[PDB]
DNA sequence: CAGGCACGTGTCAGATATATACATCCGAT
DNA sequence: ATCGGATGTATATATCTGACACGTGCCTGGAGACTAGGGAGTAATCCCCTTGGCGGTTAAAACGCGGGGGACAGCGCGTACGTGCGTTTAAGCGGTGCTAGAGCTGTCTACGACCAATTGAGCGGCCTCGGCACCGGGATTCTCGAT
DNA sequence: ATCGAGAATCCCGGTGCCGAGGCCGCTCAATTGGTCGTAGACAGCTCTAGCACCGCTTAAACGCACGTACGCGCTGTCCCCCGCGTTTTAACCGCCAAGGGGATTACTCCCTAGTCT
């Protein structure tokens, strides 16, 4: 898998900004948002994969993601 | 032909996407991006669907909060258009830089 | 012997007392657990749940809905100030965001 | 196997504050996450509270102080009164 | 006589207090403020000297960090002077508001 | 114990801003800073007094302040 | 005889084992866990002391003060991330002035 | 009381055989050690409960080190931790 | 059983005061 | 640019001084042996849940074309904030007393751990009709080019 | 400062869907009833440090004068982002199939808690 960061299309970032309450969006916002999303995703997935590996498992369950998020103070409700 | 002035449709979209609770990022592209990112840490991983859904929801909430802080930073600078410097300032004050 | 009457009924609570006591004992919080600690904790948890559900039902009726959805929990938590501060670092699945548009963006 | 949840307990509380209001599976699993979150939050503070004073038991006094630390403002004042009311009733059967 | 240009002495004492490791706040007024605040929660309350010193260090560090964030916010708006709107923006972004 | 919030004089706030790297200061900062400092002090001292009262003590030890700060995410080194 | 010397460390394996036992962390504590934790603590202390000693020598001093510790922590990429939310008493602040304020 | 004063000073003499340490700076070193101790041990305690285990072993301390410490710092801490355990088992 | 913690003690790294050299700012020029 | 005057920084030397690092005694926390039992490693198995592929629909993304509104640069003004000087206030700093209360010991007693019956409450399986999603059309309200 | 054409939005009704809630069977974990070790509650004593007071000295705070430079309002340029129409295109739904491993139970063995020195 390569260049899947471009799967986060400009309309998706536009909709996220609209939900965040942004009226006008600059052209350079999309690339910055893709980079920030990538950094956040690596940060969460590193801990999730660590939790999965410690359990001698090969599947990343939802509880691993929940624990990884809770470690960084995000504390997601819902799943698990 | 009837053409709406630029401010109106943006605000309409704002209200529409603030009233709802759907996921705004597509699901297969996000799943492919998650798998790509997870290849670096351990090869041949089998993601459970609920884990991908939780990742998408957490990332979307984080992006919405970051865009809110970016919007306030943009308004602070006597502006309406958000710029990457606004995102950088928000992340720097929040403690992510 | 005697008729078994559950500890949650002796305290008037709805949340379990035996379950909370078992979780405290098997949670490695302390070497020993007192008798009144599960009762107090169950009462506190029941109060918090009732307080949230009151506002959640209020939000549900305000939307002409009979059932409670995560949007109603999100609205109830974010509208109340003390619940907002209690759960300020918590993301609720399928909850959305509070409608709020900045005044400068509003059209002249 | 035999999974444990607060679904029965949350539903009973719902039917007394709102007798004609239901709840969905999605919404009810969030209430299960909330209760488990607060349970670990209060018990963790009480566990540290006993260790700070070199104690070996978690009593209602430790739980009361942890509630006063974690819950803000009026939310703590009402919770303490609810907690003490149950203990007195329990102590007198 | 001679008069330094505005800002030069102001650019100084930044170079002093960023190299200095003193407290910069008078100790007895801070002690009195702590006692006045604390009497609302419990009367006839006694304080340890180390407790007041720890409170002073923590308060000063918090204020210094808030002032750095305020400076960043003020520079973001193309300004050199800091206004209370910058403090409010920094506190709002940091989650205190 | 009355009006000791004014004990935090203007030059003290200027010195703190200079350590924070601030060049110019407006007149309303000298009150905004007092307000935020008062809020922070109330928030910390409430928890410190709560710990002291739980410990069946009438003296607020430095360890109570350390615990209260560690509870708010502001861990402090040097006092225990 | 001592477990610290048997593992080639300077931090106390026995004291860490006792703190783990009284800690209430878990019902049982393994044999290698105190050794591993003592090794990790020793490594972290050694890194702090290296950076603090260098910072102290850069200031023509032969003794470590909290200012040197603060400078060492803030001037390291990863030690700053590890102790970002930590306040050091009598540590001061890192000397830094924004370029816009400079004339 | 009990502290790490003897142990921290020994580590300094190996790292800087001439540099010393003041009383207030060295108490900060003590508070740092207990802070990191509770971070790893607290995280390891959650790992046992998460996996329904009842024992804390070297596998839980190792994972807690990777979770807390950043990238390059954690890699050497694992290497130092692994080295000590192997030598301890052999001797 | 011995290492680590109270307790006591010599002593030198560091703070302070004073004189001297000097990198830097500012008004004309 | 530039050149001298004049402040505020570095630097060297004398001169104390009080924490720092080192002996010294001692006792309690760490070590070595031995024993027993339950936690966990290992084997084997079932099914379920993840992955891979294919086919058709179509809503969403990509692209192009105005064009108007917001970002940005330049100008001018006035007023609020620095910099300096004289005056006043109170913060350290040194002593004294003085007693409330943190801290350490000694009983002993109620309280929590623990084990053997006992049974009812919560969880898994399985309906079923009613709340809610969707569509189709009409009435209502907001917007924008025109007076 | 209004006015009507046009587009977006709310509402009212009708229809179908699937899951929220209720019921039934059944375990196993909560309940009772006892014993017994010990954690800490209480009484008592000690010293110590936190509080209060007084006097002196001088460093810092305060108030004022004054200049100036920077924050703010205004105006002009222009460029770039938004609205809208047309053309791909790949997400999504439905369906099928295969096998990898995630939970389970049995068996055993040896690692660690406990006690003594």
PDB file of N, CA and C in Angstrom, chain D residues 18-61:
ATOM      1  N   UNK D  18     -37.833   8.696  33.592  1.00  0.00           N
ATOM      2  CA  UNK D  18     -38.591   8.874  32.353  1.00  0.00           C
ATOM      3  C   UNK D  18     -39.315   7.572  32.053  1.00  0.00           C
ATOM      4  N   UNK D  19     -40.516   7.392  32.611  1.00  0.00           N
ATOM      5  CA  UNK D  19     -41.206   6.096  32.486  1.00  0.00           C
ATOM      6  C   UNK D  19     -41.553   5.702  31.060  1.00  0.00           C
ATOM      7  N   UNK D  20     -41.640   6.652  30.130  1.00  0.00           N
ATOM      8  CA  UNK D  20     -42.065   6.368  28.765  1.00  0.00           C
ATOM      9  C   UNK D  20     -40.975   6.686  27.745  1.00  0.00           C
ATOM     10  N   UNK D  21     -39.712   6.524  28.128  1.00  0.00           N
ATOM     11  CA  UNK D  21     -38.577   6.805  27.258  1.00  0.00           C
ATOM     12  C   UNK D  21     -37.685   5.576  27.177  1.00  0.00           C
ATOM     13  N   UNK D  22     -37.330   5.181  25.954  1.00  0.00           N
ATOM     14  CA  UNK D  22     -36.456   4.053  25.725  1.00  0.00           C
ATOM     15  C   UNK D  22     -35.014   4.469  25.493  1.00  0.00           C
ATOM     16  N   UNK D  23     -34.214   3.496  25.068  1.00  0.00           N
ATOM     17  CA  UNK D  23     -32.801   3.726  24.786  1.00  0.00           C
ATOM     18  C   UNK D  23     -32.341   2.674  23.786  1.00  0.00           C
ATOM     19  N   UNK D  24     -31.495   3.092  22.851  1.00  0.00           N
ATOM     20  CA  UNK D  24     -30.989   2.211  21.810  1.00  0.00           C
ATOM     21  C   UNK D  24     -29.741   1.470  22.283  1.00  0.00           C
ATOM     22  N   UNK D  25     -29.365   0.440  21.521  1.00  0.00           N
ATOM     23  CA  UNK D  25     -28.161  -0.324  21.837  1.00  0.00           C
ATOM     24  C   UNK D  25     -26.918   0.550  21.753  1.00  0.00           C
ATOM     25  N   UNK D  26     -26.846   1.399  20.725  1.00  0.00           N
ATOM     26  CA  UNK D  26     -25.717   2.313  20.583  1.00  0.00           C
ATOM     27  C   UNK D  26     -25.621   3.255  21.776  1.00  0.00           C
ATOM     28  N   UNK D  27     -26.756   3.822  22.191  1.00  0.00           N
ATOM     29  CA  UNK D  27     -26.758   4.747  23.318  1.00  0.00           C
ATOM     30  C   UNK D  27     -26.486   4.041  24.638  1.00  0.00           C
ATOM     31  N   UNK D  28     -26.953   2.801  24.791  1.00  0.00           N
ATOM     32  CA  UNK D  28     -26.779   2.093  26.052  1.00  0.00           C
ATOM     33  C   UNK D  28     -25.350   1.611  26.255  1.00  0.00           C
ATOM     34  N   UNK D  29     -24.642   1.264  25.178  1.00  0.00           N
ATOM     35  CA  UNK D  29     -23.244   0.897  25.312  1.00  0.00           C
ATOM     36  C   UNK D  29     -22.366   2.064  25.710  1.00  0.00           C
ATOM     37  N   UNK D  30     -22.792   3.284  25.390  1.00  0.00           N
ATOM     38  CA  UNK D  30     -22.080   4.469  25.853  1.00  0.00           C
ATOM     39  C   UNK D  30     -22.271   4.650  27.354  1.00  0.00           C
ATOM     40  N   UNK D  31     -23.487   4.398  27.849  1.00  0.00           N
ATOM     41  CA  UNK D  31     -23.731   4.457  29.286  1.00  0.00           C
ATOM     42  C   UNK D  31     -22.954   3.386  30.038  1.00  0.00           C
ATOM     43  N   UNK D  32     -22.701   2.240  29.403  1.00  0.00           N
ATOM     44  CA  UNK D  32     -21.836   1.238  30.018  1.00  0.00           C
ATOM     45  C   UNK D  32     -20.392   1.710  30.060  1.00  0.00           C
ATOM     46  N   UNK D  33     -19.955   2.425  29.023  1.00  0.00           N
ATOM     47  CA  UNK D  33     -18.606   2.977  29.022  1.00  0.00           C
ATOM     48  C   UNK D  33     -18.461   4.071  30.071  1.00  0.00           C
ATOM     49  N   UNK D  34     -19.506   4.881  30.261  1.00  0.00           N
ATOM     50  CA  UNK D  34     -19.443   5.960  31.243  1.00  0.00           C
ATOM     51  C   UNK D  34     -19.309   5.413  32.659  1.00  0.00           C
ATOM     52  N   UNK D  35     -20.111   4.400  32.998  1.00  0.00           N
ATOM     53  CA  UNK D  35     -20.104   3.868  34.358  1.00  0.00           C
ATOM     54  C   UNK D  35     -18.766   3.211  34.668  1.00  0.00           C
ATOM     55  N   UNK D  36     -18.241   2.426  33.725  1.00  0.00           N
ATOM     56  CA  UNK D  36     -16.945   1.787  33.925  1.00  0.00           C
ATOM     57  C   UNK D  36     -15.829   2.819  34.025  1.00  0.00           C
ATOM     58  N   UNK D  37     -15.955   3.926  33.291  1.00  0.00           N
ATOM     59  CA  UNK D  37     -14.962   4.992  33.360  1.00  0.00           C
ATOM     60  C   UNK D  37     -14.948   5.635  34.742  1.00  0.00           C
ATOM     61  N   UNK D  38     -16.126   5.995  35.254  1.00  0.00           N
ATOM     62  CA  UNK D  38     -16.209   6.662  36.548  1.00  0.00           C
ATOM     63  C   UNK D  38     -15.839   5.701  37.673  1.00  0.00           C
ATOM     64  N   UNK D  39     -16.226   4.429  37.544  1.00  0.00           N
ATOM     65  CA  UNK D  39     -15.871   3.431  38.548  1.00  0.00           C
ATOM     66  C   UNK D  39     -14.359   3.318  38.694  1.00  0.00           C
ATOM     67  N   UNK D  40     -13.647   3.225  37.569  1.00  0.00           N
ATOM     68  CA  UNK D  40     -12.191   3.174  37.621  1.00  0.00           C
ATOM     69  C   UNK D  40     -11.598   4.497  38.082  1.00  0.00           C
ATOM     70  N   UNK D  41     -12.254   5.612  37.759  1.00  0.00           N
ATOM     71  CA  UNK D  41     -11.748   6.921  38.154  1.00  0.00           C
ATOM     72  C   UNK D  41     -11.839   7.115  39.661  1.00  0.00           C
ATOM     73  N   UNK D  42     -12.993   6.793  40.250  1.00  0.00           N
ATOM     74  CA  UNK D  42     -13.181   6.991  41.685  1.00  0.00           C
ATOM     75  C   UNK D  42     -12.353   5.989  42.479  1.00  0.00           C
ATOM     76  N   UNK D  43     -12.376   4.719  42.068  1.00  0.00           N
ATOM     77  CA  UNK D  43     -11.639   3.694  42.799  1.00  0.00           C
ATOM     78  C   UNK D  43     -10.133   3.902  42.705  1.00  0.00           C
ATOM     79  N   UNK D  44      -9.643   4.396  41.567  1.00  0.00           N
ATOM     80  CA  UNK D  44      -8.226   4.698  41.457  1.00  0.00           C
ATOM     81  C   UNK D  44      -7.791   5.815  42.386  1.00  0.00           C
ATOM     82  N   UNK D  45      -8.600   6.873  42.482  1.00  0.00           N
ATOM     83  CA  UNK D  45      -8.298   7.961  43.406  1.00  0.00           C
ATOM     84  C   UNK D  45      -8.348   7.488  44.852  1.00  0.00           C
ATOM     85  N   UNK D  46      -9.354   6.682  45.198  1.00  0.00           N
ATOM     86  CA  UNK D  46      -9.449   6.145  46.551  1.00  0.00           C
ATOM     87  C   UNK D  46      -8.290   5.206  46.857  1.00  0.00           C
ATOM     88  N   UNK D  47      -7.852   4.430  45.864  1.00  0.00           N
ATOM     89  CA  UNK D  47      -6.708   3.543  46.058  1.00  0.00           C
ATOM     90  C   UNK D  47      -5.443   4.340  46.355  1.00  0.00           C
ATOM     91  N   UNK D  48      -5.221   5.423  45.608  1.00  0.00           N
ATOM     92  CA  UNK D  48      -4.097   6.307  45.895  1.00  0.00           C
ATOM     93  C   UNK D  48      -4.283   7.009  47.231  1.00  0.00           C
ATOM     94  N   UNK D  49      -5.532   7.326  47.578  1.00  0.00           N
ATOM     95  CA  UNK D  49      -5.816   8.036  48.819  1.00  0.00           C
ATOM     96  C   UNK D  49      -5.429   7.211  50.039  1.00  0.00           C
ATOM     97  N   UNK D  50      -5.720   5.908  50.015  1.00  0.00           N
ATOM     98  CA  UNK D  50      -5.326   5.042  51.121  1.00  0.00           C
ATOM     99  C   UNK D  50      -3.812   4.875  51.181  1.00  0.00           C
ATOM    100  N   UNK D  51      -3.157   4.794  50.021  1.00  0.00           N
ATOM    101  CA  UNK D  51      -1.706   4.638  49.996  1.00  0.00           C
ATOM    102  C   UNK D  51      -1.000   5.884  50.514  1.00  0.00           C
ATOM    103  N   UNK D  52      -1.570   7.064  50.257  1.00  0.00           N
ATOM    104  CA  UNK D  52      -0.964   8.304  50.734  1.00  0.00           C
ATOM    105  C   UNK D  52      -0.913   8.348  52.256  1.00  0.00           C
ATOM    106  N   UNK D  53      -1.969   7.878  52.916  1.00  0.00           N
ATOM    107  CA  UNK D  53      -2.050   7.884  54.369  1.00  0.00           C
ATOM    108  C   UNK D  53      -1.583   6.575  54.989  1.00  0.00           C
ATOM    109  N   UNK D  54      -0.902   5.729  54.213  1.00  0.00           N
ATOM    110  CA  UNK D  54      -0.390   4.437  54.673  1.00  0.00           C
ATOM    111  C   UNK D  54      -1.497   3.585  55.288  1.00  0.00           C
ATOM    112  N   UNK D  55      -2.630   3.530  54.598  1.00  0.00           N
ATOM    113  CA  UNK D  55      -3.767   2.732  55.027  1.00  0.00           C
ATOM    114  C   UNK D  55      -3.888   1.488  54.152  1.00  0.00           C
ATOM    115  N   UNK D  56      -4.638   0.506  54.651  1.00  0.00           N
ATOM    116  CA  UNK D  56      -4.787  -0.771  53.969  1.00  0.00           C
ATOM    117  C   UNK D  56      -6.223  -1.090  53.582  1.00  0.00           C
ATOM    118  N   UNK D  57      -7.176  -0.213  53.884  1.00  0.00           N
ATOM    119  CA  UNK D  57      -8.582  -0.481  53.643  1.00  0.00           C
ATOM    120  C   UNK D  57      -9.201   0.715  52.929  1.00  0.00           C
ATOM    121  N   UNK D  58     -10.128   0.428  52.020  1.00  0.00           N
ATOM    122  CA  UNK D  58     -10.895   1.450  51.320  1.00  0.00           C
ATOM    123  C   UNK D  58     -12.266   1.492  51.980  1.00  0.00           C
ATOM    124  N   UNK D  59     -12.502   2.523  52.782  1.00  0.00           N
ATOM    125  CA  UNK D  59     -13.759   2.703  53.481  1.00  0.00           C
ATOM    126  C   UNK D  59     -14.608   3.743  52.757  1.00  0.00           C
ATOM    127  N   UNK D  60     -15.790   4.015  53.314  1.00  0.00           N
ATOM    128  CA  UNK D  60     -16.667   5.026  52.734  1.00  0.00           C
ATOM    129  C   UNK D  60     -16.058   6.418  52.831  1.00  0.00           C
ATOM    130  N   UNK D  61     -15.184   6.641  53.815  1.00  0.00           N
ATOM    131  CA  UNK D  61     -14.514   7.931  53.937  1.00  0.00           C
ATOM    132  C   UNK D  61     -13.590   8.186  52.753  1.00  0.00           C
TER     133      UNK D  61
END
